[PDB]
Design a binder for these strands. Structure first.
Lengths: 75, 177, 118, 230
RNA sequence: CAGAGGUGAAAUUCUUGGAUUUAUUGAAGACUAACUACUGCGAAAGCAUUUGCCAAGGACGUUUUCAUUAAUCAAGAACGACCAUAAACUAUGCCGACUAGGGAUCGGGUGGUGUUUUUUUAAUGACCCACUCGGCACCUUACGAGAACUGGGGGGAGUAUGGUCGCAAGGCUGAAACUUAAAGGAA
């Protein structure tokens, strides 16, 4: 439970498989996997002490297209 | 050539609207190997037959595995990776390991993982495609990966957690390179 | 016109067995396994080893006078994997490529029917 | 240590061919090796225990018997021919794995019946619960009393089909799959039941030899052969 | 006839007194594969081959019978010298005295009137539809004070330390009372 590389690989197994033997360790991770992996790590670190109304800011999407995005995703 | 070979699986009823869609792709992907295949939609079956032009003797076995993968509800671009020599199936049996239903579903959900993380990390490490369905575990991949996932699943139905096997798989990759 | 043996290809992991017997199964004609052709002790199951074993199987079957084989392809079965190893399709392909006619491919691995696990 | 030197064991091998009983179509099924007929283990008694597993499609010319392998037991040797008799019947595993589907029940039965000879046979039966046409519920399960009643009539009418048959009559009865039609007609009063099959027939005990009965199953034959020319 | 296991590779092990593979047969101890389900039964732990016996149980049907015989639980009771063993490990949800529903399914019942069934041997099905009772669940809705195998310090994330308790540096070893051998280290 206190292994860091193992648990990071576990919860970033999904987007490594989405944006790929395979590589998982940093100093071998090429672009979009690297950007989203680093962003996921920074979110997970900053969600403890940062405020909940300030850590996860949504991208500003208009109403009638964000609701359609949500409806198609729920479908 | 050969004399005749004919295998057939039969699929559950809800799959027919998917199999009707993908069926022309199955005929392309098997007619490049000279294997006929019918999709019966009234008796609910899929048959594959060795035709008169089949010079590969063993490909009817992989066509059999392909149609029972389609019956066991893996999708088509996943399942046509069985027609190539380096890849095979395995159907692990997990029902006969533990007694009570609570411990069974908790060890099987442990095999899947939180958010699917354990299963996706296992697919990544073993280079396999794994389906935990019902009281069995389907898997497609190379044979070293199939050996690895079979020992992982059986020891997960026994009491040792699967992230120990995921850790030793990472250790063994970075120890084999 | 053909004389028929049977193939009895037992393709586990770690090894493959290409073992032609007669139509009964009582008399054997050239059992040669995979690990006796080329042994690094881990390439015994490999398609190259299964192709070598099936090729000199077909040599001795053409020597004795068998023109065709009924293929019985099994895995380790039992309370175990039930899937044929990488050598089964390779041994079948090498048996067909080395002159023998193939008939009646069937899958005779021992499904354990309520086994002895726990 | 020291192992052995080889001396080629196909110079002492003798080829026999296997004549099937005349309850079939084309009866030359193949050939068989045995060691050469020496004194102290003659070849004609090195044989006589061998069963061969042939395909009923190869024995009957068609291809709707592509499953359903059978066993023929070698009984009497004469003149480089192995005359066989029926020894059992079995499906291939792929046939009943191709038959089993979820959302139905398989009713399987078996009976140990002694025929009009003194062969005793364990004979099996499988049947799967159909759904009717216009049935909209996805299940079509039997209510397990329908299973007990179906299995009861399966046991009764197939132990009526045996005892009322010899081995040759039973074999000629189960080649064109007609005991399955008897089960279907006798059971459609209870449940629909798709694809009833017999699937497996095992010999348990066999009475005696009776060379006359075997040669009446095959055909006659007796030889006065050649004479030495000195 | 010369290897077979097994492994990421290996190895312990078996093997020309024939292992592994193949065929026939016997014996043993288990187990009941697929069918197998967000299905069933059981007070719970739990229960899957066939047939029979033994008692039991539930739901339904009932213009049968008794007539308040009832509900909840502290206490107590039932179930739960040889051969040596695993359990948890990511989870979830708002509760009750509470309104209506919806689809699917299991057991019973009533009605309809088509198809599979079928006939002067007994009775007995299967499916479709509506209604209804009772279950295992699931998806929703409306409305309520919902108060009055034992041992426990006090939030999370950090930062500093002239306090107290520890652990820790030196410096070629031999080699100090001896400026000392061999050998080793380092460069």
């Amino acid at each position: 439970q206190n292994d860091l590389e193992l648990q990071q690989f576990l919860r970033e197994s999904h987007l490594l498989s989405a944006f790929n033997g395979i590589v998982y360790q940093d100093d071998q991770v090429i672009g979009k996997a690297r950007s989203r992996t680093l962003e996921m790590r920074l979110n997970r670190l900053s969600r403890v002490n940062g405020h909940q109304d300030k850590i996860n800011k949504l991208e500003k999407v208009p109403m009638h297209i964000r609701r359609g995005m949500i409806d198609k995703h729920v479908k | 050539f050969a004399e005749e070979s004919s295998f057939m699986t039969l699929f559950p009823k809800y799959r027919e609207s998917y199999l009707k869609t993908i069926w022309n792709d199955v005929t392309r992907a098997l007619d490049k190997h000279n294997i006929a295949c019918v999709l019966d939609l009234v008796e609910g079956s899929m048959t594959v037959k060795t035709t008169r032009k089949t010079y590969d003797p063993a490909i009817i076995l992989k066509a059999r595995d392909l149609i029972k993968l389609l019956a066991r509800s893996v999708p088509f671009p996943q399942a046509v990776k069985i027609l190539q020599d380096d890849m095979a199936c395995d159907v692990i049996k997990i029902g006969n390991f533990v007694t009570n239903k609570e411990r069974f579903v908790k060890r099987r959900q442990r095999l899947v993982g939180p958010n699917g993380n354990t299963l996706k990390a296992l697919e990544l490490l073993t280079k396999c495609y794994i389906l935990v369905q019902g009281n069995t575990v389907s898997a497609m991949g190379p044979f070293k990966g199939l050996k690895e996932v079979r020992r992982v699943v059986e020891d997960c139905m026994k009491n040792i957690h699967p992230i120990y096997h995921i850790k030793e798989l990472m250790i063994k990759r970075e120890l084999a390179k | 016109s053909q004389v028929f043996g049977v193939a009895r290809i037992y393709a586990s992991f770690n090894d493959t067995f290409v073992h032609v017997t007669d139509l009964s199964g009582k008399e054997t004609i050239a059992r040669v396994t995979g690990g006796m052709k080329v042994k690094a002790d881990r390439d015994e199951s490999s398609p190259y080893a299964a192709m070598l074993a099936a090729q000199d199987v077909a040599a001795k079957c053409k020597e004795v006078g068998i023109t065709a084989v009924h293929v019985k392809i099994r895995a380790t079965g039992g309370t175990r994997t039930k899937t044929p190893g990488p050598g089964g399709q390779a041994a079948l392909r090498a048996l067909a490529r080395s002159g023998l006619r193939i008939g009646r491919i069937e899958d005779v691995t021992p499904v354990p029917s309520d086994s002895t696990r726990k | 240590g020291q192992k052995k030197r080889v001396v080629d064991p196909f110079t002492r091998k003798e080829w026999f061919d296997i004549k099937a009983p005349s309850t079939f179509e084309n009866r030359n099924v193949g050939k068989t090796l045995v060691n050469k007929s020496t004194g102290l283990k003659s070849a004609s008694d090195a044989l006589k225990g061998r069963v061969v597993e042939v395909c009923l499609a190869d024995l009957q010319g068609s291809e709707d018997h592509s499953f359903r392998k059978i066993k023929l037991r070698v009984d009497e040797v004469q003149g480089k021919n192995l005359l066989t008799n029926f020894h059992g019947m079995d499906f291939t595993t792929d046939k009943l794995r191709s038959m089993v589907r979820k959302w139905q029940t398989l009713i399987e039965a078996n009976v140990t019946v002694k025929t009009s000879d003194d062969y005793v046979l364990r004979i099996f039966a499988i049947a799967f619960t159909r759904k009717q046409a216009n049935q909209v519920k996805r299940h079509s399960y039997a209510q397990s009393s329908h299973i007990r009643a179906i299995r009861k009539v399966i046991s009764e009418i197939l132990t009526k089909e045996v005892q009322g048959s010899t081995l040759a009559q039973l074999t000629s009865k189960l080649i064109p799959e007609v005991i399955n039609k008897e089960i279907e007609n006798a059971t459609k009063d209870i449940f629909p039941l798709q694809n009833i099959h017999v699937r497996k027939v095992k010999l348990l005990k066999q009475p005696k030899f009776d060379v006359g009965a075997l040669m009446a199953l095959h055909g006659e034959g007796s030889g006065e052969e050649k004479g030495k020319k000195v």
